[PDB]
Symmetry: C3
Amino acid sequence: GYITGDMKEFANWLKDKPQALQFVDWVLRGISQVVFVSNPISGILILVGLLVQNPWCALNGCVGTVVSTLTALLLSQDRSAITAGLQGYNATLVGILMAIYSDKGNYFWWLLFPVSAMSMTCPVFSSALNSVLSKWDLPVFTLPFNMALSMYLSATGHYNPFFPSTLITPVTSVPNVTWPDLSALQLLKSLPVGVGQIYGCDNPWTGGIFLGAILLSSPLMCLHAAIGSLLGIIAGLSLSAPFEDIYAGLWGFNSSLACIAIGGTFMALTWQTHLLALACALFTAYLGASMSHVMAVVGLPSGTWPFCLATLLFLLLTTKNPNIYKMPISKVTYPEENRIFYLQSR
Amino acid sequence: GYITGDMKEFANWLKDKPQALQFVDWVLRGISQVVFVSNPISGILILVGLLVQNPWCALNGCVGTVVSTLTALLLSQDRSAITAGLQGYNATLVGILMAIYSDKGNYFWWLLFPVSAMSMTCPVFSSALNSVLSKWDLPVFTLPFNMALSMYLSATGHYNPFFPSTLITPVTSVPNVTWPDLSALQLLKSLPVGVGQIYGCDNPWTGGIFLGAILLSSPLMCLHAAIGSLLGIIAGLSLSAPFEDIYAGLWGFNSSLACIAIGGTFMALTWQTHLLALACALFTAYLGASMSHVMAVVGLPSGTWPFCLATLLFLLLTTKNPNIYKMPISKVTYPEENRIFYLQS
Amino acid sequence: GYITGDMKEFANWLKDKPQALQFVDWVLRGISQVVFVSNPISGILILVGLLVQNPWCALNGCVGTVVSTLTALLLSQDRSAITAGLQGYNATLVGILMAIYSDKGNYFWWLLFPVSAMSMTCPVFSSALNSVLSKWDLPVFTLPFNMALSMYLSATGHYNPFFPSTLITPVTSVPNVTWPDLSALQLLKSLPVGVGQIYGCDNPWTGGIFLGAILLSSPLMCLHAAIGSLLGIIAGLSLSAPFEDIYAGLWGFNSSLACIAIGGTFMALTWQTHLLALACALFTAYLGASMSHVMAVVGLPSGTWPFCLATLLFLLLTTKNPNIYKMPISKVTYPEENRIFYLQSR
Ligand SMILES: CCCCCCCCCCCCC/C=C\[C@@H](O)[C@H](CO)NC(=O)CCCCCCC
Ligand SMILES: CCCCCCCCCCCCC/C=C\[C@@H](O)[C@H](CO)NC(=O)CCCCCCC
Ligand SMILES: CCCCCCCCCCCCC/C=C\[C@@H](O)[C@H](CO)NC(=O)CCCCCCC
Ligand SMILES: CCCCCCCCO[C@@H]1O[C@H](CO)[C@@H](O)[C@H](O)[C@H]1O
Ligand SMILES: CCCCCCCCO[C@@H]1O[C@H](CO)[C@@H](O)[C@H](O)[C@H]1O
Ligand SMILES: CCCCCCCCO[C@@H]1O[C@H](CO)[C@@H](O)[C@H](O)[C@H]1O
Ligand SMILES: CCCCCCCCO[C@@H]1O[C@H](CO)[C@@H](O)[C@H](O)[C@H]1O
Ligand SMILES: CCCCCCCCO[C@@H]1O[C@H](CO)[C@@H](O)[C@H](O)[C@H]1O
Ligand SMILES: CCCCCCCCO[C@@H]1O[C@H](CO)[C@@H](O)[C@H](O)[C@H]1O
Ligand SMILES: CCCCCCCCO[C@@H]1O[C@H](CO)[C@@H](O)[C@H](O)[C@H]1O
Ligand SMILES: CCCCCCCCO[C@@H]1O[C@H](CO)[C@@H](O)[C@H](O)[C@H]1O
Ligand SMILES: CCCCCCCCO[C@@H]1O[C@H](CO)[C@@H](O)[C@H](O)[C@H]1O
Ligand SMILES: CCCCCCCCO[C@@H]1O[C@H](CO)[C@@H](O)[C@H](O)[C@H]1O
Ligand SMILES: OC[C@H]1O[C@@H](O)[C@H](O)[C@@H](O)[C@@H]1O
Ligand SMILES: OC[C@H]1O[C@@H](O)[C@H](O)[C@@H](O)[C@@H]1O
Ligand SMILES: OC[C@H]1O[C@@H](O)[C@H](O)[C@@H](O)[C@@H]1O
Ligand SMILES: OC[C@H]1O[C@@H](O)[C@H](O)[C@@H](O)[C@@H]1O
Ligand SMILES: OC[C@H]1O[C@@H](O)[C@H](O)[C@@H](O)[C@@H]1O
Ligand SMILES: OC[C@H]1O[C@@H](O)[C@H](O)[C@@H](O)[C@@H]1O
Ligand SMILES: OC[C@H]1O[C@@H](O)[C@H](O)[C@@H](O)[C@@H]1O
Ligand SMILES: OC[C@H]1O[C@@H](O)[C@H](O)[C@@H](O)[C@@H]1O
């Protein structure tokens, strides 16, 4: 009732309340915005899921969210966007993945310094990218996160004396894939792990929690999150990816995100638009593969660049099919509410 | 007369006729669009040239063209662009080059699955790139092809168990070049081989057939294709490229395309604009070496990125000289008819 | 008196007199535009600093400037920009760094051929980039130079039989940094060396001279040049860079340029923009590291790519703070005159 979707009522209720609680609320919506959700309860559930995988990653994610939100305020960015959590989600990722990609492991306190630095960067990236992309009425997605992360990880690299990153190298031989060995149960677990990997978690229970957090806000978003993850697995098997990479959900997170995006969030949901989302989800998985190989040559991970590039690409697609409709950015909420706008005008 | 230029007489006639015949027309015009030509007789001639070199590559080219054109229809893309062949050329290249860059050799039938998949992305890449580039009134050129190709070849790579690509590695030592062995005859043959390479064909006869196919539509385009190829050869020599790379036309195809593009087609042909096409063709050959080196590090070929980036760069150049005029995209056809618009505007 | 700032009085006097002096004026203003200065006395002084470092680089710089200026005239480019020197500074850099990155050493006379050819591409690169960037009211900065150089050095490479470039390879082990060895004297020298490295000069005297040339035109530009160089040093230390790299001013030149740009030149100088300039300079230094690692994998230097991208990113940041004001391109002079324009309309 009051804890579904955008929580419009709880938003209007807080407006008159203390600054501290209002701040905590924006942070939690910042966390949920990683999956296009603006819901503080979803934020709590996600944070819980993060504490379940790795309490270290949760801390860095939270520090990241706090610093960026505070930086957006220092730099007088738009209040609507802040309250909606749009100034926190990129730095939520910056903090988690910097911890994930650190060769120094859990509770390396020194990590907090470059996390804050890089989190402060996110409002700057967001603003700049917005100046360009809003001219086509495109969102920034997690481009701020991916630029910050690629920048940070290549500046340090595996051989930095203070902050070595994990070593990543290109493929240099044909992997042996034993097809009889392929487990049905393991593919099924890959689905929630693909979703877990959105926040860089490889735990199946965590991904289930994220699925639930999403479901609280929008069942349609939850559905596409799942399907996107599945399609990533399918693409993985089609190029003969090592099973262990599929099981770890590394083929599923970009696809999961792209599918949510196209499947009713940034395009109004119709059957044609649902087919479009599957296509985009597949395409993203294959671009994930491409970017992973190419970037490994420079010791970088692909991050969510593949999601950003493919999704932006599909949103710049135009058609003379009236059933394929791009939402105005200023009207973008969740699929259920988005669809009502489509039925009234198209 | 009827079989020259844009063939707009035959197109008007075909409009009333059966669906399947119209479709063959669009497919054939898609094939000729690789060299900016919208002519089904040129499409046929080019296809013959292809079937001559390697029927396997020819087949993949056609499957791409078909699948793309069908995807364009399925996704309600502009009709006129489809009928002009603008929705088939990128995938013609996707199919041919996916064959060239496969480590599996001829008639590896499975290759048809990814060729089809990648050919479906071509209308998507086209529309997305148009949404950006049309704001500066620029065409997308072969950017859809080059994106699709770089994506596919890097997602697979030389070490894919299913679809290995051919191994491509950077240069690791100074090539020994024996200058007395340089051959005028071989250099001269490198001219049509460079035009052949536009469709990934290293045969001088095939390249001759392509020049013939172009000439039928537009003598001026044919001339710039030849000139562009020549300038690429000059660029390779200027950089002491290994003779065999020059001989295989690898320095010629980007140059050739750039020279056609600037030399009458996207710029109105004047003596100034001709010099510009010469400059662009040189520049493009140089960028080709740059991109080939850099891309070899990640195991990719340069494709026709060089032509795409260089030509877009020269089209974005603004000048206060009235004799250097950029064609409005909606009024772009071939240099002979383009020049009439320029004189009458 | 008449030898500071634009020298708008002196240029108005030249508007009448012989073409060869007018041309020489443009070449000299072209040389100074490297550090955002349009002043021919500044140009002569910079030229002296180049001749002090290495006459061979100085020559190639000059061939660069002249050839590029001749080309912009041939291609009927805007004359206002030519007389201001905006058509010479990219090729000044092209000529100089082509000599620096040549593996053939001093007075390899054949080098003058591709220097001339790459200089001819500079106005082409400037115009096209202007076509795109002027839509957001942005300058091209040194993007023509950086495109020209990246293309040239990668088209040739270390293994080219005519024009081999110097060999650049990525980092492959953790360097050993002994902190007790850090030197105050060497660090102090790093500051002017950073400014010298804007023209690829590693001589502290040359960097001294360049500071003097800037000071002559705009003392506020001089201040930010020095601060930016210092912030790059601080960034280097913060990531435990090899001391010798910091001593060569390798961490200083990009951040120096960024600091001049934001700190009065393309943003009106206020307290707020001064701070923003310090942030942009730190940011630029870290991107320098990033771009250097990545571009070394393909055997290329970063050039001033980091400065170009960082500064453009900062010029695209919008805020609801009226103390942070972006200069209209048509209005940009030096910081002192810029601030006056701003205060009038504030
Ligand atoms: C349109 C007009 C406006 C222009 C505005 C300019 C915007 C400036 C953007 C500056 C962002 C640079 C930081 C991002 C990544 C870098 O760390 C490096 C660059 O090699 N990335 C890497 O090493 C790898 C990243 C590669 C990802 C592929 C990107 C498609
Ligand atoms: C302003 C709004 C527009 C936003 C639209 C976003 C468009 C994104 C395109 C996404 C598709 C990319 C596919 C092409 C190449 C990739 O596979 C990778 C990239 O790392 N290949 C490579 O590394 C090789 C590619 C190198 C070619 C040079 C690039 C100029
Ligand atoms: C908005 C629509 C208008 C589109 C207009 C197209 C503009 C065409 C510009 C293309 C010229 C670029 C050539 C420069 C350098 C290259 O040779 C090499 C290889 O890619 N650089 C490198 O390997 C290093 C490059 C690293 C720098 C990162 C670039 C962001
Ligand atoms: C504000 C400037 C921050 C830079 C200081 C970072 C200090 C790095 O910390 C160092 O890292 C070593 C290995 O990486 C560890 O063994 C030690 O904990 C520490 O000496
Ligand atoms: C979603 C589509 C996935 C297709 C995966 C094909 C699985 C069978 O793969 C087959 O396995 C054999 C040995 O087990 C190999 O010798 C064959 O090369 C291979 O095609
Ligand atoms: C859409 C999914 C396509 C899967 C097709 C996989 C094709 C596998 O191809 C296999 O390659 C082997 C080489 O290692 C050969 O020895 C086998 O004979 C061949 O069947
Ligand atoms: C296209 C302009 C470049 C001219 C370079 C030509 C150098 C080739 O050299 C020529 O090759 C001939 C082979 O046909 C030989 O007969 C000649 O002996 C030889 O001089
Ligand atoms: C535009 C006109 C195209 C010119 C085509 C010239 C083809 C010459 O081609 C040559 O043919 C010889 C046998 O005939 C072979 O021995 C050579 O290897 C081959 O290069
Ligand atoms: C369009 C410009 C073409 C370039 C022609 C270069 C001619 C190469 O000339 C060769 O250079 C070598 C030194 O590099 C010498 O050792 C050889 O004796 C000489 O013949
Ligand atoms: C535009 C074409 C320019 C051609 C430049 C030719 C450069 C000749 O390069 C020469 O090669 C010799 C043999 O390795 C070297 O010993 C010499 O140092 C070098 O000057
Ligand atoms: C821009 C036009 C200038 C072209 C001058 C090129 C002439 C080549 O100059 C040669 O360079 C060699 C390498 O340093 C020297 O060994 C020779 O002394 C010199 O003749
Ligand atoms: C801006 C960054 C702070 C600079 C750190 C200062 C470290 C200098 O260290 C000093 O170096 C001198 C050599 O010149 C030695 O004589 C001194 O003994 C030593 O303490
Ligand atoms: C301006 C920021 C200065 C950065 C902190 C410099 C102090 C370096 O601290 C050093 O950490 C090293 C771990 O790699 C140890 O080997 C050294 O013994 C220790 O002194
Ligand atoms: O807060 C959790 C604690 O976990 C331990 O493993 C770390 O060593 C402590 O530094 C940390 O405070
Ligand atoms: O984890 C790295 C280091 O972080 C520092 O902030 C703490 O003082 C140390 O206890 C710890 O070893
Ligand atoms: O009333 C809804 C109307 O909206 C328009 O924007 C559509 O193009 C019409 O075809 C439609 O009937
Ligand atoms: O056209 C398809 C067939 O071509 C023939 O020339 C070959 O013998 C076969 O291996 C191939 O499958
Ligand atoms: O070249 C591999 C091919 O082998 C044939 O026997 C199969 O029928 C094809 O589907 C397969 O792609
Ligand atoms: O200044 C011109 C002269 O300078 C000398 O130092 C070089 O060695 C010569 O190659 C050159 O002719
Ligand atoms: O590289 C570090 C070296 O610095 C010198 O100043 C010391 O005397 C050596 O003992 C030390 O090994
Ligand atoms: O007038 C400029 C001054 O403004 C104040 O707000 C700052 O605190 C000072 O540090 C600064 O020097």
